[PDB]
Amino acid sequence: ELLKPRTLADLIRILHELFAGDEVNVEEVQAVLEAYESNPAEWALYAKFDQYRYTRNLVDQGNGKFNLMILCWGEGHGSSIHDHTDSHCFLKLLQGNLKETLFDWPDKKSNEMIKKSERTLRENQCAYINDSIGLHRVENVSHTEPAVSLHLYSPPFDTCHAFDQRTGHKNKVTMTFHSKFGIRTP
Numbered sequence: 001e002l003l004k005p006r007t008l009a010d011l012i013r014i015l016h017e018l019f020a021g022d023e024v025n026v027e028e029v030q031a032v033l034e035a036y037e038s039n040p041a042e043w044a045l046y047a048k049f050d051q052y053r054y055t056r057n058l059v060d061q062g063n064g065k066f067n068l069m070i071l072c073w074g075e076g077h078g079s080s081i082h083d084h085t086d087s088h089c090f091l092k093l094l095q096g097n098l099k100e101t102l103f104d105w106p107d108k109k110s111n112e113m114i115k116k117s118e119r120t121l122r123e124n125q126c127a128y129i130n131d132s133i134g135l136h137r138v139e140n141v142s143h144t145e146p147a148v149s150l151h152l153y154s155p156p157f158d159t160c161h162a163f164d165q166r167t168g169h170k171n172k173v174t175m176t177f178h179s180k181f182g183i184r185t186p
């Protein structure tokens with residue numbers, strides 16, 4: 001029985017129930033994430049920016065079956081084109097806007113990866129990606145406004161691949177947490 005999360009803490013409680021089982025109802029999880037109304041005071045602890053690139057800040061370790069984290073994107077900060085390592089990946093905007101560009105999995109032949117589409121994710125919207133949908137790049141194209149997003153992955157993963165837009169060639173990247181539970185982890 002999906003109810004509106006009153007706060008980030010409440011959202012976290014609800015996610016624990018939604019992942020209590022072995023499977024994931026994606027539309028339910030997306031609906032719940034979207035229904036949470038971003039309250040900057042509730043997530044200020046996790047919103048740790050870096051001047052040069054976006055940061056990943058662990059919020060909740062889940063129950064074995066998922067991770068929840070907050071990503072902070074300075075003006076002009078973006079990601080590589082990348083996958084999500086056979087996991088569900090939900091992205092909800094907490095502040096500002098991000099541009100998401102979608103790409104197809106490349107062919108083994110070296111070739112330019114051409115975008116299949118792009119959209120602007122706006123405050124409070126929750127997007128979903130998984131490998132069956134494709135690859136994406138996410139960027140804060142704003143010149144004046146930082147962005148903050150809330151990400152949920154299941155199962156958790158700490159490696160992914162970055163793709164070279166010119167060739168489609170991939171390289172494994174190990175993902176790191178800038179902070180965990182509000183504590184900077186260098």
Ligand SMILES: [Fe+2]
Pocket residue numbers: 082083084089136138
């Ligand atoms: Fe991503």
